[PDB]
């Protein structure tokens, strides 16, 4: 059997290359900026025209009573992900302020 002869320490070694730095892409052109602005604008109009959904109302009500941990549990069960819940709570909080 030609397997499992080296230790983990010696398997971790590596050859000394010379690396190339990554080309950063930070510049964003004028036309790309206007494009992003118009999309964010459109998102405002929808919220203005049609308002909040039932679970969003129930959520925001709990935030007024400082029921932070109840709101957390509630949102987790509605959206599934604990990450989506943490994000949606932060967006709702900012809307109320």
């Amino acid at each position: 059997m030609k397997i499992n002869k080296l230790n983990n320490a010696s398997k971790a070694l590596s050859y000394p290359v010379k690396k190339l730095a990554k080309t950063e892409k930070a510049p964003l052109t004028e036309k790309q900026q206007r494009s992003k602005e118009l999309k964010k604008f459109a998102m405002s109009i929808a919220r203005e025209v049609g308002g909040l959904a039932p679970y969003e109302l129930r959520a925001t009500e709990l935030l007024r009573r400082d029921e932070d941990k109840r709101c957390k549990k509630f949102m987790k069960k509605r959206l599934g992900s604990l990450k989506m819940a943490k994000k949606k709570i932060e967006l709702l909080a900012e809307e109320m302020r």
Binding site: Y15, V17, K18, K19, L20
Partner: protein
């Protein structure tokens, strides 16, 4: 079951199993030969195969061996002074998915491009090549070899300073 054997494990239980024979092997070989030949006439002066880069193999087991890859990157082509549309016209393969992460790997693939450019010859029409009696190249172009090297010797004073 009787006596001493390695315990059986032969998988022939399934009644829907198909068998594949290979009686066609010599004939299909002859067809592949005849297709290449006729394809070679359609583009007579030009090689049938394109030029390909040299890359390094994958795991810890094959690190020390070099191999042909799919295509040159936009950076390799540009560094050797060409443009992508021209490279295609001259029979160089292109792969825009590949990335460059080393100095060494880049330098070697630039050499291949410059070597190939130098060995080419250009013609106005097919008849000109025909009249000059040009013989078209067959097989892969500039393939790697990966031989075993040879044992170098070193003087006892060097041993302290370089370590092979």
């Amino acid at each position: 079951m009787r006596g001493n054997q390695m315990l059986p494990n032969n998988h022939f239980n399934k009644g829907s199993m198909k068998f594949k024979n290979w009686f066609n092997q010599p004939m299909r070989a002859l067809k592949r030969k005849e297709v290449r030949e006729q394809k070679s006439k359609i583009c007579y002066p030009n090689p049938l195969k394109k030029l390909r880069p040299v890359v390094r193999c994958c795991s810890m087991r094959y690190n020390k061996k070099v191999r042909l890859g799919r295509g040159f990157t936009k950076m390799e082509i540009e560094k050797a002074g060409m443009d992508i549309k021209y490279a295609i016209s001259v029979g160089i393969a292109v792969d825009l998915r590949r990335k460059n992460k080393n100095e060494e790997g880049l330098e070697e693939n630039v050499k291949r491009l410059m070597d190939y450019k130098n060995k080419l010859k250009f013609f106005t029409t097919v008849r000109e090549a025909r009249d000059n009696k040009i013989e078209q190249y067959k097989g892969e172009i500039m393939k790697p070899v990966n031989i075993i090297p040879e044992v170098k010797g070193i003087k006892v004073e060097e041993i302290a300073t370089i370590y092979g």
